[PDB]
Amino acid sequence: MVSKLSQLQTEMLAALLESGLSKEALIQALG
Amino acid sequence: VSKLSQLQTEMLAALLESGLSKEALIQAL
């Protein structure tokens, strides 16, 4: 729980996976 | 474009631009 930005990033990634975005598509975009 | 796909896309670009570490990505996966 380092920073407001890190907490928000964490929530966003979780939300995306919940919405149906694959893990592979996440990796493609952000890896 | 579908509104859902577009929102996901825009969230991804914002994440990328915000400086998401390689470790943070691994942790979320």
PDB file of N, CA, C and O in Angstrom, chain A:
ATOM      1  N   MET A   1       0.829  -1.178   0.000  1.00  0.00           N
ATOM      2  CA  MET A   1       0.000   0.000   0.000  1.00  0.00           C
ATOM      3  C   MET A   1       0.893   1.270   0.000  1.00  0.00           C
ATOM      4  O   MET A   1       0.809   2.159   0.831  1.00  0.00           O
ATOM      5  N   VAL A   2       1.798   1.269  -0.939  1.00  0.00           N
ATOM      6  CA  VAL A   2       2.792   2.304  -1.155  1.00  0.00           C
ATOM      7  C   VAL A   2       2.382   3.729  -1.531  1.00  0.00           C
ATOM      8  O   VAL A   2       2.840   4.698  -0.949  1.00  0.00           O
ATOM      9  N   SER A   3       1.473   3.845  -2.489  1.00  0.00           N
ATOM     10  CA  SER A   3       1.070   5.181  -2.925  1.00  0.00           C
ATOM     11  C   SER A   3      -0.321   5.167  -3.449  1.00  0.00           C
ATOM     12  O   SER A   3      -0.830   4.100  -3.779  1.00  0.00           O
ATOM     13  N   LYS A   4      -0.930   6.351  -3.504  1.00  0.00           N
ATOM     14  CA  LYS A   4      -2.285   6.436  -4.057  1.00  0.00           C
ATOM     15  C   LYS A   4      -2.304   5.906  -5.503  1.00  0.00           C
ATOM     16  O   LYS A   4      -3.248   5.223  -5.920  1.00  0.00           O
ATOM     17  N   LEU A   5      -1.257   6.258  -6.283  1.00  0.00           N
ATOM     18  CA  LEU A   5      -1.199   5.807  -7.652  1.00  0.00           C
ATOM     19  C   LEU A   5      -1.063   4.306  -7.741  1.00  0.00           C
ATOM     20  O   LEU A   5      -1.747   3.659  -8.527  1.00  0.00           O
ATOM     21  N   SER A   6      -0.200   3.704  -6.905  1.00  0.00           N
ATOM     22  CA  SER A   6      -0.079   2.234  -6.965  1.00  0.00           C
ATOM     23  C   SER A   6      -1.367   1.531  -6.597  1.00  0.00           C
ATOM     24  O   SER A   6      -1.750   0.545  -7.239  1.00  0.00           O
ATOM     25  N   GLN A   7      -2.099   2.042  -5.569  1.00  0.00           N
ATOM     26  CA  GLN A   7      -3.365   1.433  -5.189  1.00  0.00           C
ATOM     27  C   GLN A   7      -4.369   1.528  -6.314  1.00  0.00           C
ATOM     28  O   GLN A   7      -5.064   0.580  -6.618  1.00  0.00           O
ATOM     29  N   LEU A   8      -4.445   2.689  -6.975  1.00  0.00           N
ATOM     30  CA  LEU A   8      -5.370   2.854  -8.081  1.00  0.00           C
ATOM     31  C   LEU A   8      -4.996   1.923  -9.246  1.00  0.00           C
ATOM     32  O   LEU A   8      -5.886   1.343  -9.885  1.00  0.00           O
ATOM     33  N   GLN A   9      -3.709   1.809  -9.563  1.00  0.00           N
ATOM     34  CA  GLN A   9      -3.273   0.886 -10.624  1.00  0.00           C
ATOM     35  C   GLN A   9      -3.696  -0.540 -10.325  1.00  0.00           C
ATOM     36  O   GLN A   9      -4.204  -1.249 -11.204  1.00  0.00           O
ATOM     37  N   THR A  10      -3.543  -0.957  -9.042  1.00  0.00           N
ATOM     38  CA  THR A  10      -3.926  -2.292  -8.623  1.00  0.00           C
ATOM     39  C   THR A  10      -5.406  -2.553  -8.875  1.00  0.00           C
ATOM     40  O   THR A  10      -5.829  -3.611  -9.381  1.00  0.00           O
ATOM     41  N   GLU A  11      -6.230  -1.580  -8.490  1.00  0.00           N
ATOM     42  CA  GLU A  11      -7.697  -1.694  -8.671  1.00  0.00           C
ATOM     43  C   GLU A  11      -8.070  -1.788 -10.156  1.00  0.00           C
ATOM     44  O   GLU A  11      -8.923  -2.541 -10.537  1.00  0.00           O
ATOM     45  N   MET A  12      -7.437  -0.955 -10.972  1.00  0.00           N
ATOM     46  CA  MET A  12      -7.699  -0.956 -12.396  1.00  0.00           C
ATOM     47  C   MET A  12      -7.368  -2.309 -13.032  1.00  0.00           C
ATOM     48  O   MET A  12      -8.143  -2.814 -13.870  1.00  0.00           O
ATOM     49  N   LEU A  13      -6.185  -2.849 -12.728  1.00  0.00           N
ATOM     50  CA  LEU A  13      -5.835  -4.175 -13.280  1.00  0.00           C
ATOM     51  C   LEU A  13      -6.866  -5.241 -12.858  1.00  0.00           C
ATOM     52  O   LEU A  13      -7.318  -6.049 -13.663  1.00  0.00           O
ATOM     53  N   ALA A  14      -7.252  -5.252 -11.588  1.00  0.00           N
ATOM     54  CA  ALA A  14      -8.247  -6.195 -11.153  1.00  0.00           C
ATOM     55  C   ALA A  14      -9.549  -6.014 -11.917  1.00  0.00           C
ATOM     56  O   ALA A  14     -10.183  -6.979 -12.363  1.00  0.00           O
ATOM     57  N   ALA A  15      -9.978  -4.755 -12.051  1.00  0.00           N
ATOM     58  CA  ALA A  15     -11.237  -4.463 -12.761  1.00  0.00           C
ATOM     59  C   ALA A  15     -11.219  -4.958 -14.205  1.00  0.00           C
ATOM     60  O   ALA A  15     -12.221  -5.450 -14.735  1.00  0.00           O
ATOM     61  N   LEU A  16     -10.070  -4.815 -14.862  1.00  0.00           N
ATOM     62  CA  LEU A  16      -9.964  -5.216 -16.228  1.00  0.00           C
ATOM     63  C   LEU A  16     -10.135  -6.713 -16.368  1.00  0.00           C
ATOM     64  O   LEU A  16     -10.841  -7.184 -17.253  1.00  0.00           O
ATOM     65  N   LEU A  17      -9.408  -7.463 -15.531  1.00  0.00           N
ATOM     66  CA  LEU A  17      -9.539  -8.933 -15.578  1.00  0.00           C
ATOM     67  C   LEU A  17     -10.992  -9.349 -15.275  1.00  0.00           C
ATOM     68  O   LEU A  17     -11.559 -10.244 -15.928  1.00  0.00           O
ATOM     69  N   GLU A  18     -11.619  -8.671 -14.301  1.00  0.00           N
ATOM     70  CA  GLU A  18     -13.007  -8.998 -13.999  1.00  0.00           C
ATOM     71  C   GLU A  18     -13.945  -8.775 -15.220  1.00  0.00           C
ATOM     72  O   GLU A  18     -14.905  -9.502 -15.422  1.00  0.00           O
ATOM     73  N   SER A  19     -13.679  -7.731 -15.997  1.00  0.00           N
ATOM     74  CA  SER A  19     -14.492  -7.388 -17.164  1.00  0.00           C
ATOM     75  C   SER A  19     -14.346  -8.350 -18.308  1.00  0.00           C
ATOM     76  O   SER A  19     -15.078  -8.258 -19.295  1.00  0.00           O
ATOM     77  N   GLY A  20     -13.378  -9.255 -18.240  1.00  0.00           N
ATOM     78  CA  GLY A  20     -13.232 -10.231 -19.323  1.00  0.00           C
ATOM     79  C   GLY A  20     -11.978 -10.117 -20.131  1.00  0.00           C
ATOM     80  O   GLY A  20     -11.755 -10.924 -21.044  1.00  0.00           O
ATOM     81  N   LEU A  21     -11.164  -9.098 -19.872  1.00  0.00           N
ATOM     82  CA  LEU A  21      -9.936  -8.967 -20.600  1.00  0.00           C
ATOM     83  C   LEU A  21      -8.992 -10.104 -20.245  1.00  0.00           C
ATOM     84  O   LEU A  21      -8.788 -10.385 -19.076  1.00  0.00           O
ATOM     85  N   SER A  22      -8.495 -10.835 -21.252  1.00  0.00           N
ATOM     86  CA  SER A  22      -7.641 -11.974 -20.891  1.00  0.00           C
ATOM     87  C   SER A  22      -6.332 -11.550 -20.246  1.00  0.00           C
ATOM     88  O   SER A  22      -5.820 -10.483 -20.511  1.00  0.00           O
ATOM     89  N   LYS A  23      -5.696 -12.501 -19.522  1.00  0.00           N
ATOM     90  CA  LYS A  23      -4.365 -12.291 -19.010  1.00  0.00           C
ATOM     91  C   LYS A  23      -3.362 -12.096 -20.153  1.00  0.00           C
ATOM     92  O   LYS A  23      -2.477 -11.250 -20.109  1.00  0.00           O
ATOM     93  N   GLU A  24      -3.546 -12.861 -21.222  1.00  0.00           N
ATOM     94  CA  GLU A  24      -2.672 -12.705 -22.354  1.00  0.00           C
ATOM     95  C   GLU A  24      -2.754 -11.281 -22.976  1.00  0.00           C
ATOM     96  O   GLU A  24      -1.769 -10.631 -23.298  1.00  0.00           O
ATOM     97  N   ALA A  25      -3.980 -10.758 -23.158  1.00  0.00           N
ATOM     98  CA  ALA A  25      -4.161  -9.389 -23.690  1.00  0.00           C
ATOM     99  C   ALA A  25      -3.584  -8.355 -22.752  1.00  0.00           C
ATOM    100  O   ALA A  25      -3.027  -7.344 -23.187  1.00  0.00           O
ATOM    101  N   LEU A  26      -3.674  -8.596 -21.422  1.00  0.00           N
ATOM    102  CA  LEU A  26      -3.046  -7.685 -20.482  1.00  0.00           C
ATOM    103  C   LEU A  26      -1.523  -7.628 -20.686  1.00  0.00           C
ATOM    104  O   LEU A  26      -0.882  -6.582 -20.743  1.00  0.00           O
ATOM    105  N   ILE A  27      -0.932  -8.834 -20.798  1.00  0.00           N
ATOM    106  CA  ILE A  27       0.484  -8.944 -21.047  1.00  0.00           C
ATOM    107  C   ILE A  27       0.893  -8.284 -22.363  1.00  0.00           C
ATOM    108  O   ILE A  27       1.874  -7.575 -22.461  1.00  0.00           O
ATOM    109  N   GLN A  28       0.130  -8.532 -23.403  1.00  0.00           N
ATOM    110  CA  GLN A  28       0.430  -7.939 -24.708  1.00  0.00           C
ATOM    111  C   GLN A  28       0.522  -6.446 -24.629  1.00  0.00           C
ATOM    112  O   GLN A  28       1.376  -5.832 -25.254  1.00  0.00           O
ATOM    113  N   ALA A  29      -0.444  -5.827 -23.909  1.00  0.00           N
ATOM    114  CA  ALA A  29      -0.488  -4.373 -23.813  1.00  0.00           C
ATOM    115  C   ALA A  29       0.568  -3.740 -22.899  1.00  0.00           C
ATOM    116  O   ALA A  29       1.087  -2.651 -23.209  1.00  0.00           O
ATOM    117  N   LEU A  30       0.815  -4.395 -21.731  1.00  0.00           N
ATOM    118  CA  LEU A  30       1.598  -3.820 -20.681  1.00  0.00           C
ATOM    119  C   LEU A  30       2.966  -4.408 -20.398  1.00  0.00           C
ATOM    120  O   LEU A  30       3.708  -3.826 -19.603  1.00  0.00           O
ATOM    121  N   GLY A  31       3.234  -5.575 -20.958  1.00  0.00           N
ATOM    122  CA  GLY A  31       4.494  -6.298 -20.784  1.00  0.00           C
ATOM    123  C   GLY A  31       5.546  -5.676 -21.688  1.00  0.00           C
ATOM    124  O   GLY A  31       6.723  -5.923 -21.518  1.00  0.00           O
TER     125      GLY A  31
END
